[model samples]
Target: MDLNRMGKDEYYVQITVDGKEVHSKADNGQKYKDYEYKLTGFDKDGKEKELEFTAQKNLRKEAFLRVYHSDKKGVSAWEEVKKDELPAKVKEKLGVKLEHHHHHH
Candidate 1:
């Protein structure tokens, strides 16, 4: 999409799993790929294991961005949530609750 024709500010969401960070752009008329990477880890026998996964996303019907996070570089327990649902979702999944307050001008 052409930003000049819209004259609107675009916002994006960043989801980080360890040192890897992925970005998702705002609600455009089209969808986009969020992230696809090969994660490295080790098994009980210290054997190196690689898991390839993608957090591909499409524009949702709601005014929110959807994302997932893999804490151990593995595709297990992928925490998926929307931007608007972050507060509660974060607390539920990551045990962190961030409060946001709005002030009127």
Candidate 2:
């Protein structure tokens, strides 16, 4: 029921779709209407970097941030892992899905 219940620094298992990191926003409030992901890179000033990602559409489910199981901490952080880091069976499950699907009615 509470969609925007994510805490600061909370961690999630982000599925690596490709080189481009992606994330989806939940439709709970108007704040998420312009939500998106941004890559933070360092500047020449040696200060902390920041980015502002733009949203093409407010209704898209291509990317989602799934919560991790071992989240003992309260912070919302991303659980970034390599392909080889995944368990054997876990990797196989990803292969069960078809490459692409098209539907027409």
Candidate 3:
């Protein structure tokens, strides 16, 4: 068994979805968790890294995430993730920065 030892529980995987943004379609309302929101890859300096995964909403055009935990038989509902949303140390794990000059979010 290969355990990508990083942390024991929880992960916030960021993704770079490079697709033409679009928003104009709605119908399926009873199909929650209908897809596998998966993510896997590496870290800076070419290090391997990964997050378990979570899902309930459609992966829009592009975005970042702060997945709290992934307990296959369970799920930790997450929220919008901003760089500041992450703790100081958590921020370092993922050098995610934004040009947000103010702290109002």
Candidate 4:
């Protein structure tokens, strides 16, 4: 679907983690509860290809809040991912650069 043509509630916001498209959904009053990654590109054989999978679930309410907020500021959505919030495969495949906050005791 063409997101540009969709109304506010018709389509989820799109963000690129590394280069893959990550779409956030499920806005219930405060935060998003569902997310998905969609990969669409041309295959080696000059054929169109597409693959989609659930990206994240059961995230803290603040996670989606941060993502949407950051999107408004024009930044990477993955910047909001906390420790262990994303799958290892996605981290590696998407080249996610997780932010680490070290607090000195």
Q: Which ten residues in a row have the lowest lDDT in candidate 3?
A: 17-26
Off by over 4 Å in 2: 1-35, 38-66, 69-75, 97-105
- Give one digit per residue, the lDDT tens place, for model 2 in 31-105: 443444444432223233343334444323333332221235322333344446655654444455664455775
List the candidates' TM-scores in order.
Answer: 0.26, 0.25, 0.40, 0.21
Cα lDDT, model 2, residue 95:
50
In candidate 2, position 71 carries an lDDT of: 37
lDDT of 1 by residue, 8-47 (tens): 2212223332322244533574554365444443332334
RMSD of each: 17.4, 17.6, 10.1, 16.6
Location of the lowest summed lDDT over 10 successive residues in candidate 1: 8-17
- Candidate 2 pairs with clashing backbones: 9-75, 9-76, 9-77, 10-75, 10-76, 10-77, 11-76, 11-77
Superposed Cα deviation of residue 43, candidate 2 (Å): 36
lDDT scores of the candidates, listed in order: 0.38, 0.37, 0.47, 0.35
Estimate the overall C-alpha local distance difference test score of candidate 3. Answer: 0.47
Ranked candidates, highest lDDT first = 3, 1, 2, 4
Candidate 4 is scored at a TM of: 0.21
Residue 52 displacement (Å), model 2: 14
Least lDDT summed over 10 consecutive residues: which range in candidate 4?
A: 6-15
